[PDB]
């Protein structure tokens, strides 16, 4: 083993690897979403940009794993990056919709390891979710929820007034 | 079709896609290489924070892809990016090796795009080929190049020493 | 022929000349759609500044066309500025198509011209084209293709608070 | 009892006085390195201040322990600071080789102490060593082992050449 390591369980490592992949599938899902808000029979261009910013935020947190991993003296082990699930997004409201799961499926991922940690009795890792991870996580799910009553009080879907007020000030 | 589409054929919108997926799977690698170089039992931080700005540059080339494609008219469809051909990278004359062989890679498939759009008139995706990727790959084709002949010049892979030096007078 | 000229057909500098007049014409054009938004009945400044602005690019492309003219030793040769087509421009949606086919028209006798010049191996020309027009041509066509998206959004043509609304979050 | 303590175990108190004389212990142990370093027949200036630094960073460790300990209302007891292992340590690598060990002693003693912590339901003391002392020590290991790494690449113990060149680049 690594010089370095531990207290440092190999299902840990190994979940630390799945958790980097889901990371970077939850970027690559929001650049996605971008995309389909600046298509020109879209034009939300507000909405856009927050994607854009989170599939920013996701790969930073990517990032901030693979460095564990090593500091730790485990090993990154990449994976394919799956495509996203859709091709198009609907709208404002069906795009919250999937960004509230993304954001719940990933913090259950968290959490779960986060068990696994307290299983092999790993306080480092348990800090380390506890202190970068699972705060921002509550954080943007609870704003993205926000967001999702705003738009079905705006109308949404039928409500094309309503989706334009949301883009103009909303998106902040 | 779009409402903005003008002189934009739907092979080379196709082309744009494909190239967006090798952007990011460039992108990918590059991550891979900062990964292995921050191990512990290689520890070469300055060639790993090269390889972390490569990788970031590539996914910003992927970002404006997908800016160019909806300017047009075109429709971004992702596909899974896969991961890097390699787990370990060896040595940093290994690394930069692969490197090379991956600019070119990206470089052919660039010129193979322009060709296309060439063939069919379309002179606005040359001169957005041309003023937004076509140097930035001759330059870093070049500048990997160098490095290699330094790398052999100190005595990689054998010479560790040679190996040390590198990564404290190159990588800037 | 001038002591200056090489490289230079016949062909081009009259297709010059022939674009200077079309820019000219698209400069007058946004200028009645200023003039229309700015009447006491209609009443819908942002709009109206919108296009004045554009009515100043379009002049400045043509002054620019006027000295590609003189530096190559072609003669400027001008014609009547032709009148808009309409007198009276509707409201925001229709005026923002009129647009849209204008800048479209405008970009085909661009692309028409570098035609010429790539027939006529007159690479000056070509870069002129490339890095002085069309990529602007894009961003505007795109632009307010997204304008127009925005405005079938907020019911135009019949929902007048819609259109209030896009001149106060849009035009920006 | 002090009439400031609530939820903390004699088992625990007892356990803070031991930790607070192994960092003791540390700080003691790296003064040594830092003198051998600085003898004029060693002469690595650079590596003697790393080991010097590294010193005063453990007295600080055993200060916040005397803190944390009259906080709680527990009470320090003392006892003597064994004298390092060593009087003399060899070359860098060895001495790299020995405070890694060092570092992982120190850190299996804090990993105790948390579990400890956690078997006695104390969660304030578990978030004392995870945000003031865990993170810390994963780091240090980290950089050490890095450090160990490149001695080896360099050809210690028999490259003095080698070992020049990392007092000269490596210890920043
Ligand atoms: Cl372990
Ligand atoms: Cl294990
Ligand atoms: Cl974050
Ligand atoms: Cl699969
Ligand atoms: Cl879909
Ligand atoms: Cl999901
Ligand atoms: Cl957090
Ligand atoms: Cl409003
Ligand atoms: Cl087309
Ligand atoms: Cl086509
Ligand atoms: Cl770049
Ligand atoms: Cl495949
Ligand atoms: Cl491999
Ligand atoms: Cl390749
Ligand atoms: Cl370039
Ligand atoms: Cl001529
Ligand atoms: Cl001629
Ligand atoms: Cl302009
Ligand atoms: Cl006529
Ligand atoms: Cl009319
Ligand atoms: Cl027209
Ligand atoms: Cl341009
Ligand atoms: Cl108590
Ligand atoms: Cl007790
Ligand atoms: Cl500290
Ligand atoms: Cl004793
Ligand atoms: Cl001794
Ligand atoms: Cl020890
Ligand atoms: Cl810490
Ligand atoms: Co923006
Ligand atoms: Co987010
Ligand atoms: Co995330
Ligand atoms: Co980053
Ligand atoms: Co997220
Ligand atoms: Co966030
Ligand atoms: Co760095
Ligand atoms: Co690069
Ligand atoms: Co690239
Ligand atoms: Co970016
Ligand atoms: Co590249
Ligand atoms: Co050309
Ligand atoms: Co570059
Ligand atoms: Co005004
Ligand atoms: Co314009
Ligand atoms: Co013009
Ligand atoms: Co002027
Ligand atoms: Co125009
Ligand atoms: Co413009
Ligand atoms: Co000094
Ligand atoms: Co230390
Ligand atoms: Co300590
Ligand atoms: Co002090
Ligand atoms: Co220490
Ligand atoms: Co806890
Ligand atoms: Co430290
Ligand atoms: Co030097
Ligand atoms: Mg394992
Ligand atoms: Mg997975
Ligand atoms: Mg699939
Ligand atoms: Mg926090
Ligand atoms: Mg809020
Ligand atoms: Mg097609
Ligand atoms: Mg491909
Ligand atoms: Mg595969
Ligand atoms: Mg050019
Ligand atoms: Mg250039
Ligand atoms: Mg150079
Ligand atoms: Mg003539
Ligand atoms: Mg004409
Ligand atoms: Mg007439
Ligand atoms: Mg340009
Ligand atoms: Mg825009
Ligand atoms: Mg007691
Ligand atoms: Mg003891
Ligand atoms: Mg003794
Ligand atoms: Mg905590
Ligand atoms: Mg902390
Ligand atoms: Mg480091």
Redesign the interface.
């Known amino acids: 083993v ?3 390591r ?2 440092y369980h190999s299902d840990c490592e190994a979940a630390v690897n799945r958790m980097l992949n889901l990371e ?1 599938y939850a970027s ?1 899902t929001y ?2 979403m ?3 808000f ?6 939300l ?1 507000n909405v856009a940009e927050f994607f854009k910013e989170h599939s920013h935020e996701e ?1 930073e947190h990517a ?1 901030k794993f ?2 564990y ?5 485990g ?10 699930e859709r ?1 198009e997004w609907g709208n404002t409201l069906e795009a919250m919709q999937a960004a509230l799961q993304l954001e719940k499926t990933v913090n259950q991922a968290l959490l779960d390891l986060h068990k696994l940690a307290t299983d092999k ?1 790993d ?2 890792l ?3 979710l506890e202190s970068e991870y699972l705060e921002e996580q509550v954080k943007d799910i609870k704003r993205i929820g926000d967001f999702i009553t705003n738009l079905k009080r705006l109308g949404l879907p039928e409500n ?2 309503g ?3 949301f883009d ?1 000030h909303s998106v902040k």
């Open positions: 690594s010089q370095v531990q207290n970077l690559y650049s996605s971008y995309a389909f600046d298509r020109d029979d879209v034009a261009h790969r990032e693979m460095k991993q090593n500091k730790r003296g090993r990154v082990v990449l994976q394919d990056i799956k495509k996203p091709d009795v306080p480092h348990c800090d380390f094309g007034m989706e334009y007020l103009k």
